[PDB]
Amino acid sequence: GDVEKGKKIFVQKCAQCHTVEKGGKHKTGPNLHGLFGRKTGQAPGFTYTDANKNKGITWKEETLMEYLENPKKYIPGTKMIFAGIKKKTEREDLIAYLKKATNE
Template sequence: MVFRFTVPFGILLAGSAAHTGAAQTLDRLLTDPDEIAAQCGGQASAGEPLFQENCAACHSLTVEGDQSKGPHLAGLYGRAAGGVADYDYVSDLPGRDVTWEGDTLRPFLSGETGIEGHPVIEPEQVRRDLLTYVRIHTRPAPPAPEEVEVPADVLAMSGDAEYGAYLAGDCVSCHNAAAEATGMETIYGRGVETFLTLMYQYKARAIGTETMQLYATSLGDDEMAALAAYFEGADS
């Protein structure tokens, strides 16, 4: 799956690596809260009070927040240490040559850097909960619809319309003749490219409701191609 974005990504703060020690995957397109929680291994609801207690006094999750005590965390995941413009960093801060992700944040959260006054977050599960909360609540801003592009190899797929008819049950429970009579947009008779573009826009959170965004995220390219092939020729 490939998206084309021409605007900067926001933050995607990685959770700690699994107990096996495997490195966290940097995935700036990950936006599904359930997928984020699964990858980070924590619970956002448990992490929120941890953030308020340990982090909020110095760090904002948005660029608009107060930076009098610490740099904002927006854009942290994948950002070089010391990368917030116009913030006066301590010159000898440890780890200035790292890129922030789960493994590089661990020393700061576990107290290994020995920075005076920096809270120590432990045990491991508590760190996971904290990072899950931060990552979910600082997901990248969605792109504009026109900035989302369906990959050429997906557009070239020959979708299985019969399989699409099987999958369509989830769609027609809402997108049906009765709903269309009340103003809901029809999905029947759409061209394949138009249908796939809409699905990719949902997947990127560029359009639609959270329900549609999560549904699109759950589909693979072959499933979207199958649905596109079915709805192109189906009658409502």
């Protein structure tokens, strides 16, 4: 995935509700730092829905791929308001960008 394109998608579609830096603030959504290989509902300091918490999955490329295409389908009852990125290549670019950013 194109990490630069992925960063722009993040800035346009996710930054309104999320930070990704270590020690970044919760906004509407939880800070995403350390996302990859973490279970749902794990960011310290954030009020998650039970639906998010009870999903049981680990965030990684495959589960983010499916999640971000249609969040309400993946986690019925999630309070994340987002229709989804329907284009596979835009998801791959975004996720390639998140894999770097949330890790650093």
